[PDB]
C-alpha cells in the first residue's frame, strides 16, 4: 500500500479502535459495533450486528469498558440478520442495557417467523470451529419502542435524533447527533463502494419511501461524519454529499435497468450483471446465493415503481 510511507488525510476509518473522543468502532469493519461514552460510567452500542462475530465484538467492548453492567443503551437502526444479530448473545453479558429501536424492529423480534430468518441467515456466517454463547430469547430483551423524530438524551454529552427512514427495509431508522453532525444512517444510503467511493443501492422494499428518507435526510445540516451500517466512518465531502448521491446513484440504476428492459432483456441479466459487480464485498457477511437473490428483489421494486420513460 502507498499509506505505509504517507501521513495524508484519511476519507475513511475502517479500522478498529477510537474514531472520536466518544466513540470507537468495535469488532469487524465489516459490519461495525459503535460504541459511545457518555460519562465517566456510561455507554451507549449503535448498531447489532452479525452473531458469529460476539467474541470479537465483546473483546474490544472489554477493552475500553472495565464494567460491562455501565452499557445502557443499544441502538439499532433495523431489524435485517446483520443488525440485530448479536442482541441474545451480548445482551445477557450487559444486565442494565436497554436496546432502542422502531416499533415496527421491535415487532419483529416478537414473530417467530422473522426471529428464525435471523437466525438462519446468521447461522451460515459461523466461521470454522465457533460456537456461539448462550442466548437470551428474542421476545425477552430489553426493549424500548422509540418514534420518529425521538430526542434520545443518552447523556449530558449525547442527544440523538431518531429519524425514520423506510425503503431498505419498512422498519429502518436512523440516529442523528446534532452536536456533532454525525449521522448512524445503516443502510438508508446503501452500501459504500470500497472501489469506486460511491453508493451502491439498497432498496429491499420500497423504492419510493427510499428516495423520500434521502430527500429527507439531505436537508439535516451539513455532516461531518456519516457512519453506514458496513465500512467504517465516512467524512470530508463523502458525508456532506452522502444522501444526496445516494439519492442520484438510485436514479441511475433505475435508468439502467429501464434502458435494459426497453431492449428487450430479462431482468435476471441485469441481476446476475449486479451480483458479479458488487457481490464481493459482503461475501463474508451475506451468502452469495442470498446477494443474487437480494439483487433480483431490489430490481423487482425498481422495475415496478420507477418511473416509466415513456
Ligand atoms: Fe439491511
Ligand atoms: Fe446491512
Same mark, same amino acid.
Request: with cysteine.
Given at each position: 500500500?502507498?499509506?505505509?510511507?504517507?501521513?495524508?488525510?484519511?476519507?475513511?476509518?475502517?479500522?478498529?479502535?477510537?474514531?472520536?473522543?466518544?466513540?470507537?468502532?468495535?469488532?469487524?469493519?465489516?459490519?461495525?459495533?459503535?460504541?459511545?461514552?457518555?460519562?465517566?460510567?456510561?455507554?451507549?452500542?449503535?448498531?447489532?450486528?452479525?452473531?458469529?462475530?460476539?467474541?470479537?465484538?465483546?473483546?474490544?467492548?472489554?477493552?475500553?469498558?472495565?464494567?460491562?453492567? @455501565?452499557?445502557?443503551?443499544?441502538?439499532?437502526?433495523?431489524?435485517?440478520?446483520?443488525?440485530?444479530?448479536?442482541?441474545?448473545?451480548?445482551?445477557?453479558?450487559?444486565?442494565?442495557?436497554?436496546?432502542?429501536?422502531?416499533?415496527?424492529?421491535?415487532?419483529?423480534?416478537?414473530?417467530?417467523?422473522?426471529?428464525?430468518?435471523?437466525?438462519?441467515?446468521?447461522?451460515?456466517?459461523?466461521?470454522?470451529?465457533?460456537?456461539? #454463547?448462550?442466548?437470551?430469547?428474542?421476545?425477552?430483551?430489553?426493549?424500548?419502542?422509540?418514534?420518529?423524530?425521538?430526542?434520545?438524551?443518552?447523556? #449530558?454529552?449525547?442527544?440523538? @435524533?431518531?429519524?425514520?427512514?423506510?425503503?431498505?427495509?419498512?422498519?429502518?431508522?436512523?440516529?442523528?447527533?446534532?452536536?456533532?453532525?454525525?449521522?448512524?444512517? +445503516?443502510?438508508?444510503?446503501?452500501?459504500?463502494?470500497?472501489?469506486?467511493?460511491?453508493?451502491?443501492?439498497?432498496?429491499?422494499?420500497?423504492?419510493?419511501?427510499?428516495?423520500?428518507?434521502?430527500?429527507?435526510?439531505?436537508?439535516?445540516?451539513?455532516?461531518?461524519?456519516?457512519? #453506514?451500517?458496513?465500512?467504517?466512518?465516512?467524512? +470530508?465531502?463523502?458525508?456532506?454529499?452522502?444522501?444526496?448521491?445516494?439519492?442520484?446513484?438510485?436514479?441511475?440504476?433505475?435508468?439502467?435497468?429501464?434502458?435494459?428492459?426497453?431492449?428487450?432483456?430479462?431482468?435476471?441479466?441485469?441481476?446476475?450483471?449486479?451480483?458479479?459487480?458488487?457481490?464481493?464485498?459482503?461475501?463474508?457477511?451475506?451468502?452469495?446465493?442470498?446477494?443474487?437473490?437480494?439483487?433480483?428483489?431490489?430490481?423487482?421494486?425498481?422495475?415496478?415503481?420507477?418511473?416509466?420513460?415513456?
Amino acid at each position: 500500500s502507498g499509506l505505509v510511507p504517507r501521513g495524508s488525510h484519511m476519507l475513511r476509518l475502517s479500522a478498529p479502535g477510537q474514531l472520536d473522543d466518544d466513540l470507537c468502532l468495535l469488532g469487524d469493519v465489516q459490519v461495525p459495533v459503535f460504541l459511545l461514552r457518555l460519562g465517566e460510567a456510561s455507554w451507549a452500542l449503535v448498531e447489532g450486528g452479525i452473531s458469529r462475530d460476539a467474541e470479537l465484538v465483546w473483546a474490544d467492548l472489554c477493552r475500553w469498558v472495565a464494567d460491562p453492567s @455501565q452499557v445502557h443503551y443499544w441502538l439499532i437502526t433495523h431489524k435485517h440478520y446483520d443488525h440485530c444479530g448479536l442482541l441474545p448473545y451480548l445482551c445477557p453479558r450487559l444486565p442494565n442495557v436497554q436496546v432502542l429501536a422502531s416499533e415496527r424492529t421491535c415487532q419483529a423480534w416478537k414473530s417467530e417467523s422473522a426471529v428464525r430468518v435471523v437466525e438462519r441467515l446468521n447461522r451460515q456466517l459461523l466461521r470454522a470451529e465457533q460456537r456461539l #454463547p448462550e442466548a437470551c430469547a428474542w421476545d425477552a430483551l430489553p426493549v424500548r419502542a422509540v418514534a420518529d423524530g425521538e430526542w434520545l438524551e443518552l447523556g #449530558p454529552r449525547h442527544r440523538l @435524533q431518531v429519524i425514520e427512514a423506510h425503503g431498505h427495509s419498512d422498519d429502518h431508522v436512523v440516529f442523528y447527533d446534532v452536536r456533532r453532525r454525525r449521522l448512524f444512517c +445503516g443502510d438508508a444510503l446503501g452500501e459504500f463502494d470500497e472501489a469506486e467511493g460511491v453508493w451502491r443501492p439498497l432498496v429491499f422494499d420500497d423504492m419510493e419511501a427510499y428516495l423520500e428518507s434521502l430527500e429527507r435526510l439531505q436537508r439535516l445540516p451539513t455532516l461531518l461524519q456519516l457512519i #453506514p451500517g458496513h465500512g467504517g466512518l465516512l467524512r +470530508g465531502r463523502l458525508a456532506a454529499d452522502g444522501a444526496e448521491s445516494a439519492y442520484t446513484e438510485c436514479l441511475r440504476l433505475c435508468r439502467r435497468l429501464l434502458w435494459r428492459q426497453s431492449m428487450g432483456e430479462s431482468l435476471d441479466e441485469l441481476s446476475e450483471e449486479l451480483h458479479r459487480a458488487w457481490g464481493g464485498q459482503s461475501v463474508d457477511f451475506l451468502p452469495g446465493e442470498l446477494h443474487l437473490g437480494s439483487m433480483r428483489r431490489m430490481l423487482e421494486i425498481l422495475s415496478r415503481q420507477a418511473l416509466p420513460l415513456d
